[PDB]
Amino acid sequence: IQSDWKVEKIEFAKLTGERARSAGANGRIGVHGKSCTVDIARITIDGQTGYGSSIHMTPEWAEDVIGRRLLDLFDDRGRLREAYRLQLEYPVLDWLGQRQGKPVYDLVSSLVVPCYDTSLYFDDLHLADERAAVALMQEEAMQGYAKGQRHFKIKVGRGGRHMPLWEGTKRDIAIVRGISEVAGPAGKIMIDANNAYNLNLTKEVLAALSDVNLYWLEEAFHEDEALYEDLKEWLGQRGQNVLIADGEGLASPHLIEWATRGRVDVLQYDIIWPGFTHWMELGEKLDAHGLRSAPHCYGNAYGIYASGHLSAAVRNFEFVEYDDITIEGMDVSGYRIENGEIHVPATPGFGIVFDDELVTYLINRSGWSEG
């Protein structure tokens, strides 16, 4: 990177699409829907462009950044400075890989990465018949299986808000078993309560699912060291191997410490916020402790492909959280799902080919430009 290279232009557009199947409610909130959008920035440095997720960026913010040198955005250690990450880390890393003919997984390290189908929401809430609910949710897993998914995360916590407490929990249990039989003994099964349980409700559910191949338990309740210590001990005594997964949203400031003390196994900070640069630094610390990395990704299709590249820099990388989404102007065909794995194309940047012309249109129409 020459001191000659500088931020010449920054453009912003919101891209829109849909996920393949509408997502229902989860433990804590209502229907998530089918409509999807991705905020993107196009950065121009040395007459060449880079593309990527961009959040927390205003026209007035990019205004102040035009003219600065690329080198000045990096550490005296080689890390994009906290001040630029959420706004530009993806457009910048994509630029570097284009200019260098390298995929980003190279710059940071064929790439094949485990992935799970995260789309199994409360899609059964209109059905009173527990059997029909199971058949509905099984058929949803199937759709995912047919597209090459082998591992599934199932939303649970129906009884927390959206259904009567005990009836909902019975329904949870029935849905998980019923999906376990679609996945087969080799399919990994995760469950996510979105905090809708408490410790004893959790224990009851876990005990009812002794048969099932439960890979991890995600957000049973808001992270609490005392509660997770108890839960880990209870699982061990029963010889029940289920990983404890947490970390998305407004996480406890002490979550990682708790994990270093064996209370949490899987950390799940979001792939966009705190993001890619953060995750590389984090993945190193967690690797050192033998802890596992599984970045949260939902509501942002771009994060899916970011996660994939990320894995090359993280030894203990668990899964790419997958949602099947088509974003107009964002060609992700370089990627393919096969037997529970996503194959990351070995092309420059993040291997996504944006429709330059459509993007220019959306910038003009509903976005903005500085430079």
Ligand X SMILES: O=C[C@H](O)[C@@H](O)CC(=O)C(=O)O
Ligand Y SMILES: O=C[C@H](O)[C@@H](O)[C@@H](O)[C@H](O)C(=O)O
> Which of 94, 172, 192, 265: binder of ligand Y (CB under 6 A)?
192
- Min dist CB 128 to a copy of itself, Å, is 18
Residue 246 interface partner, choices ligand X, ligand Y, Mg ion, none, CB cut-off 5-8 Å depending on type: Mg ion
Residue 26 interface partner, choices ligand Y, Mg ion, a copy of itself, none, CB cut-off 5-8 Å depending on type: ligand Y
Within its chain, how far is the Cα of 168 from the centroid? 26
Contact string (CB under 6 A) for ligand Y, positions 153-182, x = contact: ------------------------------
CA separation for the pair 79, 141 (Å, rounded): 40
- Min dist CB 199 to a copy of itself, Å, is 5
Q: Is 292 in the site for ligand Y (CB under 6 A)?
A: no
Q: Is 296 in the site for ligand Y (CB under 6 A)?
A: yes
CA separation for the pair 70, 52 (Å, rounded): 16
Between the CA of residue 317 and those of 1, 186, 309, 334, 370, what are the distances in Å? 30, 19, 11, 21, 37
CA separation for the pair 50, 37 (Å, rounded): 19
CA separation for the pair 336, 148 (Å, rounded): 9
Q: Is 54 in the site for ligand Y (CB under 6 A)?
A: no
Q: Shortest Cβ contact with ligand X: which residue?
A: 298
CB 111 within 8 A of CB 311: yes
CA separation for the pair 40, 54 (Å, rounded): 5
> Which of 98, 118, 195, 202: binder of ligand Y (CB under 6 A)?
118
Instruction: Please report, as residue ranges, which positions from 239 to 298 form the binding site for ligand X (by CB under 6 A).
Output: 248, 296, 298
Residue 233 marked as a ligand binder: no
Which of 194/202 has CB closer to ligand X? 194
Output the CA angle 55-56-58, nearest 5 degrees.
110
Binding-site ranges for ligand Y (CB under 6 A): 26, 118, 192, 194, 248, 296, 298-299
